[PDB]
Write a protein that binds this ligand. Structure first.
Ligand SMILES: Cc1cc2nc3c(=O)[nH]c(=O)nc-3n(C[C@H](O)[C@H](O)[C@H](O)COP(=O)(O)OP(=O)(O)OC[C@H]3O[C@@H](n4cnc5c(N)ncnc54)[C@H](O)[C@@H]3O)c2cc1C
Length: 376
């Protein structure tokens, strides 16, 4: 009968709690520094294998009623023509859809599942992990609550699912490099459309200056009303931009005036990028950052999961897909081995080398495309 503390109730944390629960793992509590839990963020992509996991955990219909089953990816040239096209999700041969979904809508689905299945008490909101120590088979936590009081908690396992600015990671890896800048500035947003193609096709494009665009629908609710909520991502070399901010924060409001100049010359014909940016309901900015590959994640009875373990550039199958798949492996590891520290090790030896493969390949692809863009 082990008691598990999870720092962070983001996508990785909630989903892990669910995997643990399904695997029959017992007492799980999670600690979230935010006072209340909010549907923040913009569109994200859930790859088929992670949707498979979420469906296995009984989330299939909640996803089906929220997210878009993206069936197609088109890359279009600067005149609007489809150059490359590919199937996605079931049509591409996967047993499950890829789901394009609003992050905060996904978080709410996860939060409700956890609340229903292990009681409202499982999610301790307003409680950020600050101090950590492993002492005699037991993890001992200093936390601080809403309106400032310190709190002491203990557990058999501590799972650091606490995102980009992970305190558990910082405890475990005090010699870590700062966030690594990939050299690309991103703006993110949502715009309302009546129709955007068939409502389930992802669009990609780029400049001769390597300004890239990604736009895809993310809302089943809108589609069921005739409408389309189109998520968009604008990616611009930071060498073009200069320093937009001293911060890397998932909720940083961006400026129409910073991003538009880069897209203003576009004439796609069928798709109006100026209109897309101009009618945003939200612009956020974010510098494309990751962290260096670690040779190890955890130590003793403390491990790492999600962005805390392996922050990657937010594209494709990175992010939530990897965090959900981490949780599956951790629950399975913990279920299989009675000796907790060996289970925790067995979990990351499954997940770390893959995560490090992706980090290094992403950097290299990015590097190569930038070098190519830079020649005259
Ligand atoms: C508000 C917000 C908006 C986001 N928007 C997007 C987006 O638009 N696009 C995208 O790709 N990704 C977004 N992300 C990141 C995305 O959720 C993750 O990259 C990915 O899905 C894996 O999530 P994760 O659980 O590892 O980290 P996260 O989802 O970032 O979860 C980390 C959680 O831990 C909490 N936390 C941090 N420190 C502590 C601590 N000291 N103690 C306890 N809790 C702590 C954070 O508040 C957060 O809730 C967003 C994250 C957040 C928090």
């Amino acid at each position: 009968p082990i008691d598990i503390l999870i720092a962070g109730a983001g996508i990785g944390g909630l989903s892990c709690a669910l995997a643990l629960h399904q695997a029959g793992i017992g007492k799980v509590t999670l600690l979230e520094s935010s006072s209340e839990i909010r549907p923040l963020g913009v569109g994200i992509n859930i790859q088929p294998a992670a949707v498979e996991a979420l469906a296995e955990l009984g989330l299939g219909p909640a996803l089906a009623a929220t997210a878009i089953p993206t069936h197609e990816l088109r890359y279009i040239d600067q005149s609007g023509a489809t150059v490359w096209s590919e199937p996605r999700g079931v049509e591409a041969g996967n047993a499950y859809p890829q789901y394009s979904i609003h992050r905060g809508e996904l978080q709410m689905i996860l939060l409700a599942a956890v609340r229903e299945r292990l009681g409202q008490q499982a999610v301790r909101t307003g409680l950020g992990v600050e101090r950590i120590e492993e002492r005699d088979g037991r993890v001992l936590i200093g936390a601080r609550d809403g309106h400032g009081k310190p709190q002491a908690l203990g557990a058999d396992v501590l799972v650091g699912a606490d995102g980009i600015h992970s305190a558990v990671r910082a405890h475990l890896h005090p010699d870590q490099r700062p966030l690594s800048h990939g050299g690309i500035t991103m703006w993110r947003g949502v715009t309302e459309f009546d129709r955007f193609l068939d409502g389930k096709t992802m669009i990609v494009a780029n400049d001769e200056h390597w300004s890239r665009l990604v736009a895809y629908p993310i809302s089943a609710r809108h589609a069921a009303e005739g409408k389309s909520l189109v998520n968009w991502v604008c990616m611009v070399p930071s060498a073009a931009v200069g320093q937009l901010d001293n911060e890397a924060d998932w909720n940083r409001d961006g400026r129409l005036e910073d991003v538009l100049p880069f897209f203003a010359d576009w004439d796609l014909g069928w798709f109006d990028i100026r209109d897309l940016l101009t009618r945003n309901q939200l612009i956020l900015q974010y510098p494309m950052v990751d962290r260096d590959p670690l040779p190890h994640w955890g130590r003793g009875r403390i491990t790492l999961l999600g962005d805390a373990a392996h922050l990657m550039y937010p594209m494709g199958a990175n992010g939530a897909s990897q965090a959900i798949l981490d949780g599956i492996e951790l629950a399975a590891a913990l279920a299989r081995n009675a000796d907790v520290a060996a289970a925790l090790r067995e979990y990351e030896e499954a997940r770390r080398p893959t995560a490090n493969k992706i980090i290094l390949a992403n950097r290299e692809r990015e590097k190569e495309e930038w070098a190519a863009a830079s020649r005259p």
